[PDB]
Amino acid sequence: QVLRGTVTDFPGFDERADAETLRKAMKGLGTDEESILTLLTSRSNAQRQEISAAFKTLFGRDLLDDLKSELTGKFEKLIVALMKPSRLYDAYELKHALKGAGTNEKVLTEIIASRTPEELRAIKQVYEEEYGSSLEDDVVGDTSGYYQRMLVVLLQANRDPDAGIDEAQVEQDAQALFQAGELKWGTDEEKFITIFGTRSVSHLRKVFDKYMTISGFQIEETIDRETSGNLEQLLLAVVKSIRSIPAYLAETLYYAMKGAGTDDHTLIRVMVSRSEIDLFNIRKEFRKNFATSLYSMIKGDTSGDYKKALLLLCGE
Ligand SMILES: [Ca+2]
Numbered sequence: 649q650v651l652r653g654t655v656t657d658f659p660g661f662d663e664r665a666d667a668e669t670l671r672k673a674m675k676g677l678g679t680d681e682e683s684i685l686t687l688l689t690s691r692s693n694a695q696r697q698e699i700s701a702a703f704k705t706l707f708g709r710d711l712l713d714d715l716k717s718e719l720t721g722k723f724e725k726l727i728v729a730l731m732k733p734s735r736l737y738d739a740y741e742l743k744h745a746l747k748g749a750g751t752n753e754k755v756l757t758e759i760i761a762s763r764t765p766e767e768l769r770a771i772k773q774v775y776e777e778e779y780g781s782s783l784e785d786d787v788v789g790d791t792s793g794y795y796q797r798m799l800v801v802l803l804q805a806n807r808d809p810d811a812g813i814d815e816a817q818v819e820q821d822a823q824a825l826f827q828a829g830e831l832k833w834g835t836d837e838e839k840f841i842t843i844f845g846t847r848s849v850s851h852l853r854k855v856f857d858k859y860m861t862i863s864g865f866q867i868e869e870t871i872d873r874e875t876s877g878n879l880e881q882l883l884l885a886v887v888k889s890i891r892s893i894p895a896y897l898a899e900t901l902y903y904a905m906k907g908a909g910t911d912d913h914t915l916i917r918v919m920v921s922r923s924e925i926d927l928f929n930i931r932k933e934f935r936k937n938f939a940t941s942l943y944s945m946i947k948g949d950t951s952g953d954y955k956k957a958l959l960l961l962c963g964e
Pocket residue numbers: 673674675676677678679718
């Protein structure tokens with residue numbers, strides 16, 4: 649999914665001095681938001697958890713409850729997201745798209761399609777431990793049809809391991825996709841799901857090329873031509889992630905920031921979930937496509953402390 653994040657372990661880290669630094673920034677009338685945003689933004693997540701622990705043993709206070717009572721809005725929502733242990737952030741985001749009453753499919757899609765099987769295994773485990781219920785049971789209860797089925801397949805976190813290309817198998821899957829969509833009166837979604845959901849990543853990159861070659865269409869155009877609604881978005885997320893997780897996340901960031909507004913929720917989530925994985929690589933793919941740094945888009949799209957914090961996450 650990887651290569652590099654923007655946030656790194658600060659050197660000569662002292663969670664006791666940091667905890668006092670944060671106590672100071674909140675103690676009394678007012679909040680020193682800048683001292684908060686600068687400290688939390690230059691501490692890796694593991695270090696934020698140590699701070700939180702030091703704070704509680706120093707003052708008998710919950711750091712998270714204090715930040716929430718001192719901060720407000722998006723900047724708040726961003727600090728809260730940043731304090732969330734890495735291990736639980738995606739489970740949280742997933743939990744939260746499944747509740748409140750109405751289901752947020754863009755969040756299921758985004759996360760399930762862009763995380764690896766190894767990340768999904770981890771995610772399934774912590775969601776169960778944290779919410780009791782099974783991620784899988786919760787998706788299915790809130791979704792239906794091929795969209796639900798495609799998510800269930802991905803949730804198995806059982807994609808074939810990369811392994812030297814079987815050209816006969818590449819031609820057969822490309823031909824199968826050709827026959828299931830373009831040559832078919834209607835569509836065979838089941839075939840798309842099986843191939844997208846279980847073939848190895850190196851194998852599907854090859855299938856996508858062979859598919860183009862055979863049909864004169866990119867698989868994304870076919871998806872657009874043959875599917876609609878939630879399934880379409882997902883199939884496109886999966887294909888884009890196969891091709892490049894970074895590129896898909898960069899793209900996700902972009903469309904978050906271009907409307908007559910800003911998707912703060914989305915914006916936070918990708919910047920925070922990927923800061924210690926591949927935000928760096930998302931940076932370069934943002935520039936590469938869209939032509940513009942993420943810094944400026946963000947810089948031009950956001951205000952305040954929020955803006956400062958975001959840019960602090962992003963860099964260069
Ligand atoms: Ca205060």
